[PDB]
Amino acid sequence: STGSATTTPIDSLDDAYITPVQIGTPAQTLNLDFDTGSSDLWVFSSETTASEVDGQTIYTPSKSTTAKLLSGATWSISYGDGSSSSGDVYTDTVSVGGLTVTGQAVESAKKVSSSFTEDSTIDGLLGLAFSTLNTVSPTQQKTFFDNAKASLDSPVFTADLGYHAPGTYNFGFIDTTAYTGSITYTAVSTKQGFWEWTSTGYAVGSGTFKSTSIDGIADTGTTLLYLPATVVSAYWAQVSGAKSSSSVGGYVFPCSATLPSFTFGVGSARIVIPGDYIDFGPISTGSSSCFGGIQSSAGIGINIFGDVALKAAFVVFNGATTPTLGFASK
């Protein structure tokens, strides 16, 4: 089997991408944030505290003839940005782009933190990291990809995120028309439960490539590119007037600036992030200070190749017995 679904930016900045997912019988379609940095499929639901729902579409398990309470199971998750959610668990039929999994754990939120409530466009998350990170207790549950894997034509999924435009998540096949050149594959460590890999270096604009190992994670659920402070300083030094602002929470730059590109290495190959992709717009409405899309990871504990980086590439998440990542230009 295969599946193919369009993913759409939630706003004009590409802050996140939503993909429609069919849950239950008859189908209830929710727009989920596919997150290669986590491993829970959780949804706003008929059980979510009413004051914490503000415009989201909810899953109502009592209206699904295939839903079953997973007795005793609870979940609770906290994300790198400080947001969180928790609740109980149902199993139900879940379909993405024509690919169907029966018996998928659907984690129903009883509580969500304010950042989720305040974003009416995201109805939940669909985790695509390794199932060892799934938070369901006392019996850990498998991700949608893990459950689908054996049925897929090939045990892979691909992320093709758009810049200010829709893109595609495919399951079970690699669309050879969706990229240019060849795909360069690189080794993955699953020791932390992430799609963790080592970039071979970087360049700023037309500058020389610096060969240096940068370990990090491929995370579709993080907006920006978080890298070591040395690398980030070298980037913003090429933008007149750019500076790190403790009050704003990162590097800002004059909105009148033209930003240089940023290249990262994948083995001997190179992925170029155009300068435009690094502009996240005014810090507040009407401001002439703009927020940068490359930020320091120093306070995180891990480097994160988020959407800023991933949307410059066609990305293969190869879930074979020994997983690997592939990157192609597009």
C-alpha positions in Angstrom: 0.0 0.0 0.0 0.8 3.7 -0.2 -0.6 7.0 0.9 -0.2 10.6 -0.3 -1.6 13.7 1.4 -1.1 17.4 0.8 0.2 19.5 3.7 -0.6 23.2 3.9 1.0 26.1 5.8 -1.2 27.4 8.6 -0.3 31.0 8.0 1.7 33.4 5.8 5.0 32.6 7.6 4.9 28.8 7.3 4.8 28.6 11.1 3.5 25.0 10.8 1.9 22.7 8.3 -1.5 20.9 8.6 -2.4 17.6 6.9 -6.0 16.2 6.8 -6.4 12.9 8.6 -9.5 10.7 8.6 -10.3 9.2 12.1 -13.1 6.8 12.9 -16.2 5.5 11.2 -17.8 7.4 9.6 -14.7 9.5 9.0 -14.0 12.5 11.2 -11.5 14.7 9.3 -9.0 16.6 11.5 -6.1 18.7 10.4 -3.0 17.5 12.2 0.5 18.7 12.5 2.8 15.9 11.3 5.8 16.0 13.7 8.9 13.9 13.0 10.1 15.1 16.4 7.5 13.3 18.5 5.6 10.0 18.7 2.1 10.6 19.9 -1.0 11.0 17.7 -3.2 13.2 19.8 -6.4 15.2 19.0 -8.7 17.8 20.4 -11.8 15.9 21.3 -15.2 15.9 22.9 -13.3 15.2 26.2 -11.2 18.4 26.0 -11.9 21.0 28.7 -14.4 23.3 27.0 -12.6 26.5 27.9 -9.5 25.1 26.2 -11.2 24.6 22.8 -11.3 27.7 20.6 -12.2 26.9 17.0 -10.5 23.5 16.6 -12.3 20.5 15.0 -12.8 17.8 17.6 -12.8 14.0 17.5 -15.9 12.5 19.2 -15.2 8.8 19.8 -18.8 8.1 20.8 -19.8 8.9 17.2 -17.3 6.4 15.7 -18.5 2.8 15.4 -14.9 1.6 15.3 -13.6 3.5 18.4 -12.8 1.5 21.5 -11.5 2.9 24.8 -8.0 1.6 25.5 -8.8 0.8 29.1 -6.5 2.3 31.7 -4.3 4.1 29.2 -3.3 7.7 29.8 -0.8 10.0 28.1 0.9 13.3 28.9 3.5 15.1 26.7 5.6 18.3 26.9 7.2 19.8 23.8 10.5 21.6 23.4 8.6 25.0 23.3 7.0 24.4 26.7 3.6 23.5 25.4 1.8 20.4 26.7 -1.3 18.2 26.5 -2.7 15.1 28.2 -5.6 12.7 28.3 -6.9 9.2 27.7 -6.7 6.8 24.7 -8.9 5.2 22.1 -8.1 2.8 19.3 -9.7 3.6 16.0 -9.2 3.5 12.2 -7.0 6.2 10.9 -6.4 7.1 7.3 -3.8 9.5 5.7 -4.0 10.1 2.0 -5.6 6.8 1.3 -3.5 4.7 3.6 -5.5 3.1 6.4 -4.3 1.7 9.8 -6.8 -0.2 11.9 -6.3 -0.2 15.7 -4.3 3.0 15.8 -3.9 4.6 19.2 -5.7 8.0 19.1 -4.8 10.0 22.2 -7.8 12.1 23.2 -6.9 15.4 24.9 -8.5 16.2 28.2 -6.2 19.2 28.7 -4.1 21.3 26.4 -1.8 24.2 27.1 -2.7 27.7 26.0 -0.6 27.7 22.9 -2.7 24.9 21.5 -5.9 26.5 22.4 -4.8 29.8 20.8 -4.0 28.1 17.5 -7.4 27.3 15.9 -5.9 25.8 12.8 -4.2 22.8 14.4 -6.5 20.0 15.6 -3.8 17.8 17.0 -0.4 16.2 16.2 0.6 13.1 14.4 4.0 11.9 15.6 6.5 10.3 13.2 9.5 9.9 15.4 10.4 6.4 16.8 7.7 4.7 18.9 10.1 4.5 21.9 9.2 8.1 22.6 5.4 7.5 22.7 4.1 8.7 26.1 1.1 6.3 26.6 1.2 4.5 29.9 1.2 1.8 31.1 1.4 0.2 27.6 3.4 2.3 25.1 1.7 2.6 21.7 3.1 2.6 18.1 3.1 5.5 15.7 0.9 5.6 12.6 4.0 4.9 10.5 5.1 2.0 12.7 1.7 0.4 12.4 1.5 1.0 8.6 5.1 -0.1 7.9 4.6 -3.8 7.2 1.8 -3.0 4.7 3.7 -0.3 2.8 5.3 -1.0 -0.6 8.6 0.3 0.9 9.1 1.1 4.6 9.5 4.9 4.1 7.8 8.2 4.2 8.8 11.5 2.6 8.4 15.1 3.5 8.2 17.7 0.7 7.3 20.9 2.5 6.5 24.0 0.5 7.8 27.6 0.9 4.7 29.7 1.2 2.9 26.9 -0.6 1.4 23.5 0.0 3.6 20.4 -0.1 3.2 16.6 0.3 3.7 13.8 2.7 4.0 10.4 1.0 4.0 7.0 2.6 5.4 3.8 1.1 7.0 5.2 -2.1 9.6 7.8 -3.3 8.2 10.1 -6.0 11.1 10.4 -8.3 9.5 13.4 -10.1 9.5 15.5 -6.8 13.2 16.3 -6.6 16.2 17.2 -8.8 19.4 15.3 -9.0 20.0 12.4 -6.7 19.0 11.6 -3.1 22.0 11.5 -0.7 21.4 9.1 2.2 23.0 9.5 5.6 23.1 7.5 8.8 20.5 7.8 11.6 20.9 7.2 15.3 17.7 6.2 17.1 19.3 6.2 20.5 17.3 9.3 21.6 14.1 8.3 19.7 14.6 11.0 17.0 15.6 11.0 13.3 19.1 12.1 14.5 21.9 12.5 11.9 25.2 14.4 11.4 25.5 17.2 8.9 28.9 17.6 7.3 29.1 21.4 7.5 27.8 24.7 6.4 28.3 27.8 4.3 26.9 31.3 4.6 25.9 32.9 1.3 28.6 32.6 -1.3 31.2 31.9 1.3 33.5 28.9 1.6 32.1 25.7 2.9 33.2 24.9 6.5 33.6 21.1 7.0 32.4 20.3 10.6 30.2 17.7 12.1 26.8 19.0 13.3 24.6 16.4 15.0 20.9 17.2 15.0 17.4 16.0 14.4 15.1 16.3 11.4 12.0 17.8 13.0 9.0 18.7 10.8 7.2 19.9 14.0 9.7 22.7 14.7 9.5 25.9 12.6 13.0 27.2 12.7 16.6 26.0 12.2 18.5 25.7 15.6 22.3 25.4 15.3 25.4 25.9 17.5 26.0 29.5 18.5 29.2 29.6 16.5 27.4 28.8 13.3 24.5 31.1 14.0 26.8 34.0 14.8 28.7 33.5 11.6 25.4 33.6 9.6 24.0 36.8 11.2 27.4 38.6 11.0 26.7 38.8 7.3 23.5 40.8 7.8 24.0 44.5 8.6 22.3 45.5 11.8 21.4 41.9 12.9 21.8 41.2 16.6 20.7 38.8 19.3 18.0 40.3 21.5 17.5 38.8 24.9 14.2 40.7 25.2 12.8 39.3 21.9 14.3 35.8 22.4 16.8 35.5 19.6 18.4 37.0 16.5 16.5 39.9 14.9 17.5 41.9 11.8 16.3 45.0 10.0 13.3 44.3 7.8 15.0 46.3 5.0 17.8 43.7 4.8 18.3 41.1 2.1 19.3 37.9 3.7 22.0 35.6 2.5 21.4 31.9 1.8 22.5 29.2 4.2 23.9 25.8 2.9 24.1 22.6 5.0 26.0 19.5 4.1 24.6 16.0 3.7 27.5 13.8 3.1 29.3 15.3 0.0 26.0 16.9 -1.1 24.7 20.4 -0.3 21.3 21.7 0.5 20.8 25.5 -0.1 18.3 27.4 2.0 17.5 30.6 0.2 17.7 33.8 2.2 14.0 34.5 1.8 13.3 31.3 3.8 15.1 32.8 6.8 12.8 35.8 7.1 10.1 35.3 9.7 8.7 38.9 9.5 8.2 41.7 12.0 8.5 40.8 15.6 5.2 42.6 16.3 2.7 44.1 13.8 4.2 47.2 12.2 7.7 46.8 13.5 10.8 47.2 11.3 12.6 44.6 13.3 12.2 41.1 11.8 12.7 37.7 13.4 15.4 35.4 12.1 14.8 31.8 11.0 18.2 30.6 12.1 18.6 30.6 15.9 21.0 29.3 18.5 20.4 25.8 19.9 22.6 26.6 22.9 19.7 26.6 25.4 18.0 23.5 23.9 20.5 20.7 24.2 20.2 19.5 20.6 20.5 21.0 17.1 17.2 21.0 15.2 16.8 20.9 11.4 13.2 22.3 11.5 11.0 23.4 8.7 13.3 26.2 7.6 15.9 23.6 6.6 13.6 20.7 5.6 11.4 22.8 3.2 14.5 23.4 1.1 14.8 19.7 0.4 12.9 16.5 -0.5 13.4 14.4 2.6 13.2 10.6 2.8 12.6 9.0 6.2 13.7 5.5 5.6 12.3 3.2 8.3 14.1 0.0 7.3 15.6 -2.2 10.0 18.6 0.2 9.9 17.0 3.6 9.4 18.5 6.3 7.3 17.6 9.8 6.1 17.8 11.0 2.5 18.0 14.6 1.2 17.6 15.9 -2.4 17.4 19.3 -3.8 14.1 20.2 -5.5 
